[PDB]
C-alpha cells in the first residue's frame, strides 16, 4: 500500500577544456534504484540496476537511451548558457542538477509532480506545485523563467507528469512487485555501553528495514525524550535495506525505565523495547 | 519513459 514515487536524479558536470561534460542519470522507484545512464561508459546506454528490470526488452532500452542522449545535449547547451549568464570563465567546472518525477497516492491519483534544477549546488528554477508556474532563485534564473513562460513549456511537463510518469510508475511496481511491493520491518534491539561509574549509554538499533522512512524515539513513561537523543542519519545497508540508531545516556539503576519506540510502515503496531536482555 | 527537457535555459 501507501504512496509511491518515480524519480530521476540527473547531474551534468563540465570539465574545463575538451572533455565533454559528465552526464549521469539515475532512476528510483520509492527507495530502490532501478536504472542508470552514465556518459563515461565507453558505450553508454540506459542500463537496469535492479534484476526485475531485465524484464524490459531491447526497444525499452533503446527508447530510454535516445531520451537520455537528447537530454545530455540539452545540458551541454544549458551549461554553456549558464556560464555566460553568470559571466564565468572557461577555466572552471560547473554543475547542473535536475530532478523530475511523480508521487502517487494508494489510489493512483497523482499527488505531486516535480521538475526542477540547481546550478552549482543552489536552486536555479523549479516547476511549482500547480505544474504551470515557475519559481526562479536568482536574477539569471529569471531570464530562464521568462523564456519558459513565453514558450509555455509547463504545459508539456504537466502533460508528462500527469499521464505518462504515472503509467510508467504503475508498470514498474508491477514488474518489480516482489521487491517493491514488500515491506521489511526493522529488526530492533538495545545495546548497553558503560560510560562512567554513574552513567551508561543505551543504543536502540533498527536494522534491515524497507522502506527508509522510520521513527526511532526514546521515552520515559510516555515522556518524549527526542530532543535529548543522539541519532544517526538513516543509512543504506547495501542489500536494499536500511539502518538507523538512537542513543540516550541514562543513570545506572534506572536503565529499565527507558523505552525505545519504533514506527515503520512494516509495523502495524509500533515496537516498544527496553534494556531487558 | 525518461522526460526530455524542452526549451533550454
Amino acid at each position: 500500500m501507501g504512496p509511491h514515487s518515480l524519480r530521476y536524479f540527473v547531474t551534468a558536470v563540465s570539465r574545463p577544456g575538451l572533455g565533454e561534460p559528465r552526464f549521469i542519470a539515475v532512476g528510483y522507484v520509492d527507495d530502490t534504484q532501478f536504472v542508470r545512464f552514465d556518459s563515461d561508459a565507453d558505450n553508454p546506454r540506459f542500463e537496469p540496476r535492479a534484476p526485475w528490470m531485465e524484464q524490459e526488452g531491447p526497444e525499452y532500452w533503446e527508447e530510454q537511451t535516445q531520451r537520455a542522449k537528447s537530454d545530455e545535449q540539452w545540458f551541454r547547451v544549458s551549461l554553456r548558457t549558464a556560464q555566460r549568464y553568470y559571466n564565468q570563465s572557461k577555466g572552471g567546472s560547473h554543475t547542473f542538477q535536475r530532478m523530475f518525477g511523480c508521487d502517487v497516492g494508494s489510489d493512483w491519483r497523482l499527488l505531486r509532480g516535480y521538475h526542477q534544477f540547481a546550478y552549482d549546488g543552489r536552486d536555479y528554477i523549479a516547476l511549482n506545485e500547480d505544474l504551470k508556474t515557475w519559481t526562479a532563485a536568482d536574477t539569471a534564473a529569471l531570464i530562464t523563467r521568462r523564456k519558459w513562460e513565453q514558450a509555455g513549456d509547463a504545459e508539456y511537463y504537466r502533460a508528462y507528469l500527469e499521464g505518462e510518469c504515472v503509467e510508467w510508475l504503475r508498470r514498474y511496481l508491477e514488474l518489480g512487485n516482489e521487491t517493491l511491493l514488500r515491506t521489511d520491518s526493522p529488526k530492533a534491539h538495545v545495546t548497553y555501553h558503560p560510560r562512567s561509574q554513574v552513567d551508561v549509554t543505551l543504543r536502540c538499533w533498527a536494522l534491515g528495514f524497507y522502506p527508509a522512512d522510520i521513527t526511532l524515539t526514546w521515552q520515559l513513561n510516555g515522556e518524549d525524550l527526542t530532543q535529548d537523543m543522539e541519532l544517526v542519519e538513516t543509512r543504506p545497508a547495501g542489500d536494499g535495506t536500511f539502518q538507523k540508531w538512537a542513543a540516550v545516556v541514562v543513570p545506572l539503576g534506572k536503565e529499565q525505565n527507558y523505552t525505545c519506540h519504533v514506527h515503520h510502515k512494516g509495523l502495524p503496531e509500533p515496537l516498544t523495547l527496553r534494556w531487558k536482555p | 519513459l525518461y522526460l526530455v527537457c524542452g526549451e533550454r535555459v
Binding site: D120, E233, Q243 | -
Partner: protein
Amino acid sequence: MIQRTPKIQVYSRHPAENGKSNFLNCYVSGFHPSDIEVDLLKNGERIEKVEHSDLSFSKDWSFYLLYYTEFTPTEKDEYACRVNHVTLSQPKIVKWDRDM
C-alpha cells in the same frame, strides 16, 4: 555557488562477528560538488576492490554515495574510511566502530 562538506558514516552491513564474512560500508553524503575520493582502509592500507553506488542526491541537492566491500572482521584488524574533497584541507579518516 554552494559548497558542502561531506558527512561520513562507517559501518557493517550486518552485526560484526569475528571470522564471519560481511560488508564494510562508508556512506558519504551531504556534499557538493560531486567530485570526491573515498577509500576503505584495513590497518591503514587501502583495500583493493571497493565498489560504489551510482551518483545521486538529496532534496537539498547535496550528493551521496555508498562505498562498500566484502570483508571478514577479526578481533585484531582495524578498518576505516578515508575521504578527500575540495572542502577538506586534508583527507578525513573515520574509523570503523562495531557498535556504531
